[PDB]
Design an enzyme around this catalytic site. Structure first.
Site, PDB file in Angstrom:
ATOM      1  N   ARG A 142      10.864   8.725  -3.634  1.00 48.15           N
ATOM      2  CA  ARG A 142      10.056   9.789  -4.350  1.00 48.15           C
ATOM      3  C   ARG A 142       9.293  10.773  -3.478  1.00 48.15           C
ATOM      4  NH1 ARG A 142       6.841   6.291  -7.983  1.00 48.15           N
ATOM      5  NH2 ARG A 142       8.152   4.499  -7.506  1.00 48.15           N
ATOM      6  N   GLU A 185       5.806  -5.709  -3.678  1.00 46.82           N
ATOM      7  CA  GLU A 185       5.857  -6.696  -4.775  1.00 46.82           C
ATOM      8  C   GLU A 185       5.704  -8.134  -4.214  1.00 46.82           C
TER       9      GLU A 185
HETATM   10  N1  LIG Z   1       1.561   2.221 -10.270  1.00 46.08           N
HETATM   11  C1  LIG Z   1       2.567   2.846  -9.670  1.00 46.08           C
HETATM   12  N2  LIG Z   1       3.259   3.841 -10.248  1.00 46.08           N
HETATM   13  C2  LIG Z   1       4.296   4.503  -9.620  1.00 46.08           C
HETATM   14  N3  LIG Z   1       4.764   4.210  -8.383  1.00 46.08           N
HETATM   15  C3  LIG Z   1       4.137   3.192  -7.723  1.00 46.08           C
HETATM   16  C4  LIG Z   1       2.983   2.465  -8.333  1.00 46.08           C
HETATM   17  N4  LIG Z   1       2.570   1.538  -7.435  1.00 46.08           N
HETATM   18  C5  LIG Z   1       3.376   1.671  -6.351  1.00 46.08           C
HETATM   19  N5  LIG Z   1       4.267   2.659  -6.520  1.00 46.08           N
HETATM   20  C6  LIG Z   1       5.313   3.054  -5.569  1.00 46.08           C
HETATM   21  O1  LIG Z   1       5.336   2.084  -4.530  1.00 46.08           O
HETATM   22  C7  LIG Z   1       5.041   2.784  -3.319  1.00 46.08           C
HETATM   23  C8  LIG Z   1       3.565   2.663  -2.995  1.00 46.08           C
HETATM   24  O2  LIG Z   1       3.229   1.282  -2.918  1.00 46.08           O
HETATM   25  P1  LIG Z   1       2.195   0.841  -1.799  1.00 46.08           P
HETATM   26  O3  LIG Z   1       3.170   0.595  -0.633  1.00 46.08           O
HETATM   27  O4  LIG Z   1       1.582  -0.353  -2.473  1.00 46.08           O
HETATM   28  O5  LIG Z   1       1.290   2.007  -1.590  1.00 46.08           O
HETATM   29  C9  LIG Z   1       5.215   4.250  -3.495  1.00 46.08           C
HETATM   30  O6  LIG Z   1       6.517   4.555  -2.972  1.00 46.08           O
HETATM   31  C10 LIG Z   1       5.059   4.466  -4.982  1.00 46.08           C
HETATM   32  O7  LIG Z   1       6.070   5.416  -5.390  1.00 46.08           O
END
Ligand SMILES: Nc1ncnc2c1ncn2[C@@H]1O[C@H](COP(=O)(O)O)[C@@H](O)[C@H]1O
Ligand SMILES: Nc1ncnc2c1ncn2[C@@H]1O[C@H](COP(=O)(O)O)[C@@H](O)[C@H]1O
Ligand SMILES: [Cl-]
Lengths: 179, 178
Positions: free
Chosen positions: B65, B102
């Protein structure tokens, strides 16, 4: 030959034997990295599309993930929005999905059911057309929302793979062709 | 701010996707409304110029994205975009970096030749949550001896302390939710 097209062609890097021996990987990365190359690519695509479809195009549809790199910019250039066709599992809400054959196994693309309404006219973009399985699956999904696929376009096309024929009768255009 | 409202009005939230408890923030409507997309890129681009002047050499877009914003942000700034990909997609020599996503591990990758020592980069993705993805991207870039000037996103989930996780690398988001 066209100077703008040359800005793109010179920024395609070819890696032999990736991912497997005998396959030549066409890497569009340098097009992205060179601002004038990327502007040239989007310009050539946009000019082709307006010339071919005039005001018929309602949205660009970008394919996950390398078509994401071109769809929004192409759409912006045409004054249109961009809808997304993703690998299965990544989009929330109601979706349609389509399985297809990719290298040695199966993959799945999906679209949100509200991405397009019936009657809406779309052009699908990806970086490259090889067997045409991915584009074909995208066309299937769009067709199922009762959207019309006007054309699929890419920067690169591998002609010996006859991806074009697979998409027929949906028209196809590429900036550059390699065997 | 009417420009910021154009982006805010086009974030859609979906409780309990992909897994119960997560409230998914979908930027799809931003992409679909050409005024909203143009607003998001302009707000990011104005921030970055106000904050860094002309020191930025490249935008780095994160798979997948961030790919939707990277190229457009880079173009508005007059810059190229480099790619940070999920592992196994890039040809030629690469390096890669693991992070928790996750319940398990994922990896991002970059070409060893993506940048030269000393080049200055701003990383973009759609959304900052825990900062694991952005933090891996910073790690990769630092391993190429690039300077990460900032990371930016459209959306930041503040209860997840992604900003602290990236510190001392600066962070800016258009919109915040808990
Ligand atoms: N609540 C959410 N809604 C949409 N995309 C998310 C969400 N949480 C995590 N992501 C996606 O997971 C990645 C960010 O997760 P993090 O590595 O935890 O910052 C990004 O690439 C986001 O596009
Ligand atoms: N030789 C190649 N070089 C780079 N990308 C490729 C190549 N062959 C296939 N692809 C990618 O795989 C998908 C096309 O496969 P196909 O469905 O066979 O047209 C697209 O996402 C392309 O980016
Ligand atoms: Cl289905």
């Amino acid at each position: 030959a066209d100077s703008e097209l040359q800005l793109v062609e010179q920024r395609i890097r070819s890696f032999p034997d990736f991912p497997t021996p005998g396959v030549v990987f066409r890497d569009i990365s340098p097009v992205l990295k060179d601002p004038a190359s990327f502007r040239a690519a989007i310009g050539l695509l946009a000019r082709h599309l307006k010339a071919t479809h005039g005001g018929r195009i309602d949205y660009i549809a970008g394919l996950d993930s390398r078509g994401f790199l071109f769809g929004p910019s192409l759409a912006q250039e045409l004054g249109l929005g961009c809808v997304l066709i993703r690998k299965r599992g990544k989009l929330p809400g109601p979706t349609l999905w389509a399985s297809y054959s990719l290298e040695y196994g199966k993959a799945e693309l999906e679209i949100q059911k509200d991405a397009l309404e019936p009657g809406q006219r779309v052009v699908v973009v990806d970086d490259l057309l090889a067997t045409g399985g991915t584009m074909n699956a995208a066309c299937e999904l769009l067709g199922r929302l009762q959207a019309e696929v006007l054309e699929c376009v890419s920067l690169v096309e591998l002609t010996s793979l006859k991806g074009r024929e697979k998409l027929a009768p949906v028209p196809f255009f590429s900036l550059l062709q390699y065997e």
